[PDB]
Paper text:
The Hanks-type Ser/Thr protein kinase (STPK) [name] and its FHA (ForkHead-Associated) substrate [name] (Oxoglutarate dehydrogenase Inhibitor) are at the core of a conserved signal transduction pathway that modulates central metabolism in distant actinobacteria. Both in [name], a soil bacterium used for the industrial production of amino acids, and in the pathogen Mycobacterium tuberculosis, [name] modulates the 2-oxoglutarate dehydrogenase activity in the Krebs cycle by controlling the phosphorylation status of the regulator [name] (called GarA in the genus Mycobacterium). [name] has a unique modular organization characterized by the presence of a highly flexible N-terminal region containing all known autophosphorylation sites and a C-terminal domain composed of tetratricopeptide repeats (TPRs) flanking the kinase catalytic core. To investigate the conservation of mechanisms involved in the regulation of [name], we studied the kinase isoform from [name] (CgPknG), which is devoid of an Rdx domain.
To investigate the structural basis of the regulation of a [name] isoform lacking an Rdx domain, we solved a high-resolution crystal structure of CgPknG in complex with the nonhydrolyzable ATP analog AMP-[name]. The final atomic model contains two copies of CgPknG within the asymmetric unit, encompassing residues 123 to 799 and 125 to 798, respectively, including a short fragment of the N-terminal region, the kinase catalytic core and the TPR domain. In addition, mFo–DFc sigma-A-weighted electron density maps clearly revealed the bound nucleotide and two Mg(II) atoms at the active site of each CgPknG molecule. Notably, even though we used full-length CgPknG in our crystallization assays, we found no evidence for residues 1 to 122 in electron density maps. Edman degradation experiments revealed that the N-terminal residue of crystallized CgPknG was Val123, suggesting that the kinase N-terminal segment was partially degraded during crystal growth and that, as similarly reported for MtbPknG, it is probably unstructured in most of its length. The absence of extensive protein-protein interactions in the crystal structure suggests that the protein is monomeric in solution, in agreement with analytical ultracentrifugation data. CgPknG and MtbPknG share the same overall fold and topology, except for the absence of a regulatory Rdx domain in CgPknG that leads to a more accessible active site. Also similar to MtbPknG, most functionally important and conserved motifs in the active site of CgPknG exhibit conformations compatible with a standard eukaryotic protein kinase active state, and the activation loop is stabilized in an open and extended conformation, permissive for substrate binding in the absence of phosphorylation. Nevertheless, CgPknG residue Glu222 is found away from the catalytic Lys205, pointing out of the active site due to an outward conformation of the helix αC, as previously reported for MtbPknG.
Residue numbers in the entry: 123 to 461, 467 to 799
The structure:
Amino acid sequence: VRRQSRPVADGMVELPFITPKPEDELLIDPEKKRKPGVAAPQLVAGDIVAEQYEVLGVIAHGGMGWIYLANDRNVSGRIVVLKGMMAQSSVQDQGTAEAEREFLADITHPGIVKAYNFIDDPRVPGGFIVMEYVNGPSLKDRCKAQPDGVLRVDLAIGYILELLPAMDYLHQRGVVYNDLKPENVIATEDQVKLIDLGAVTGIGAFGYIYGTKGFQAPEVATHGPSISSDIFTIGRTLAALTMPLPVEDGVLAPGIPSPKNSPLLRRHLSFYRLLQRATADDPQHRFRNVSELRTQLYGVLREILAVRDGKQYPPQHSLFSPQRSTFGTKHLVFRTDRIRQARITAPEIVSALPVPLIDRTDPGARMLSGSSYAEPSETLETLRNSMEDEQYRQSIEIPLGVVRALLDLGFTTEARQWLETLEGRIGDDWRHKWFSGITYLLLDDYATAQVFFNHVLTILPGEAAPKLALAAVDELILQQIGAESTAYLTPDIVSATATLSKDFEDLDASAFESLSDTWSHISSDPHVVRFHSLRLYALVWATNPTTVSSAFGLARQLMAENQIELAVQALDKLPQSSTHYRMATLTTILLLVSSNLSESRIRRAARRLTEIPTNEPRFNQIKIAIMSAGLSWLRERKLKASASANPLFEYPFSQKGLRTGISEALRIQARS
Ligand SMILES: [Mg+2]
Ligand SMILES: [Mg+2]
């Protein structure tokens, strides 16, 4: 059943159909490019092994030696692989040694190669594992088939997602794969298969673990294999598929490269964050299981496709609710009201930010269903009498439900103290870090909130909520120091950062001197705070068109960098179908006359206002703001009038004409 390319990851990626090689083109010539030191094959076509396998030839040479292909004489037409198999300790109990091999044979999953036998031929010392022949190229071959030696990042994530069910099948049975790397992942027809069955061991197994240096976790040699060490190899494999990693004597250098030295990671920083967490040095700081990694891969893939292709998908696997409100959308427009500085507030940001979804596995989950609609004073009491029950001693939803009730009652200081009490037991949980960031944000301790929200983003690199929270906290830091009009970045960096395009890749590493090697979000340097707020708003806006708070936030950061043209372009993408469209149109008009005045910007602002119906209540006050800009620009330039005799609105664009026009408009305003 030969087919077409197949959709994976909710249709966000299509994996190609790989046609299997004809069965008369599978064997390799052993004499073609004979490497140094490798001996000739001991077996040749026609040799019978264990009176059941008729050798046909060799298909590869690897660490375990030559890999033979053979007919299985007990299943008509079946071809099998004979591969060198690792011996055991030769001292363990005999039953235990047989039981481990009988467990490899019983493993049954369509994403894992089947093992048929374990034999020892006297012409080949070391014994064979007999396994299914998988007709297809390895993921390593697919990379070498590309001119730059790497797979496109979204395709590589699709392949990783396809092998995760096989990894989880092993993990749930108490065994780990150990040797995941591109060369033992084969893409055949429409499926992805793991082939290195002989490396599978139990979780925490004594003995030499046959991993690969450059992919194996650092604690395996001393502490043994674990589910966390398999997660590590998944991150290393994903890194190897997507970028040319530095190699030291045939071994991949440890660590994930800095985004200062990687165009791919520079363009997709959440992909960088995900690789960091999967390959963290401390196993405690890694994804706990495959499903945990799977959830963030979907969010990171969404941000990859939005940044690169402009494709927007709805969030389907988020750990957060959607946005609950908006913030800062009326910020710039309300300042022109007549009726003393309006500012974006912390409670306004918190009311807009999402809340974590309730975990259904928590025992106290039933106690919290209905906490949003109920009176917070009652919820606090009901959740407190629940903590008097031993069955809820280990609950996390109930104690954090108390925190929310305290924050909903305005008892912010008691909420901070109660979070401190829970630090010892549940401080590691990202939901504790999230509400710690919320609480300190409400206390106006923006530096501490930045630390907690960065911790959340580190744990959940694919989620939009911590990025918007970080972007808002960074904007509040800049607002605290009065930097909403100060520029800190060069026009080249701002232009590249605001669009998240290839220009962000063309910049040299010297442009990011103020950033740490890992582009850490924790900083009080206004240069770094402005860079992160600008970039995070841009990413959220490009990824989620409904999160309009990021569109206005992006325009605000662009305005401070004197990039009015890009700020206008950002808000012009808000569709006419949105209820915030009128606000966005008025905001772009005011952006044109907010700073760095020029005749072109003033005239464009006026012509845009003229497209707005006179029905708009703020029409006249916007018109005054534009005419006031024209007069201010004429006086700063020492110009009597503009070169053109074309009027500004109905008045001459002159110092005398606009003074009259402003006075006339002010009197229409004063009588209203
Ligand atoms: Mg056949
Ligand atoms: Mg291996």
